[PDB]
Amino acid sequence: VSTLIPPKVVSSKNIGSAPNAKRIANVVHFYKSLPQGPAPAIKANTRLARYKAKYFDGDNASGKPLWHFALGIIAFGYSMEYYFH
Amino acid sequence: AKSAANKLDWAKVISSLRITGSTATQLSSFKKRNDEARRQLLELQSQPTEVDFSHY
Fold first, then answer.
1. Are A42 and A50 in contact (CB under 8 A)?
2. B5 contacts in chain A (CB < 8 Å)
3. Where is this gene product found (chain B)?
4. Chain B residues within 8 A of A2 when measuring between CB atoms
5. A10 touches chain B (CB under 8 A)
6. How far is CA A40 from its chain centroid?
7. What is the rounded CA–CA span in Å between residue B46 and residue A32?
8. Going by fewer Cβ within 10 Å, which terminus of chain B is more open, N or C?
9. CA of B17 vs chain A CAs: smallest distance (Å)
């Protein structure tokens, strides 16, 4: 008998629907992320950070410092051999 | 000049595709179809609304 009006009721609609939560989630997820690996600070030196940079990053990751640390125990007690026996 | 009204109504029909479950909007266009199809047969159905005093 009259004009019905659901073309323009998106005003208080855009809270209730389910991907609104994902939309408001990832507009918050996307702003403070650094763009392209920026602010990396790829070099730092504290007399042993170079040891981590050469040995303990994701790139090198080989067991050799263990080997070095193995030799460290080989370096340790054998000298104590020369202190004891 | 009613075809602009009806053209925009079918434009809103292919736009009311986007909202499935139209309660009474197409029924409102059904009511304008009802009386607009009624008025044309009403105006074509009648005689000149007068007693023909010359012949009749």
1. no
2. none
3. Mitochondrion; Mitochondrion inner membrane
4. 28
5. no
6. 11
7. 75
8. N
9. 11
Are A3 and B28 an interchain contact pair (Cβ–Cβ within 8 Å)? yes
The structure was resolved to a resolution in Å of 3.8
Cβ within 8 Å of residue B28, ≥6 positions away? A1, A2, A3, A4
Experimental technique, in short, is cryo-EM
Asked if B26 and A7 touch (Cβ cutoff 8 Å), the reply is: no
| C-alpha distance from residue B4 to each of A7, A14, B7, B11, B20 (Å) | 19, 32, 5, 10, 24
CA distance A61 to A64: 9
Query: Which residue do the tokens 């950070």 mark?
Result: A49
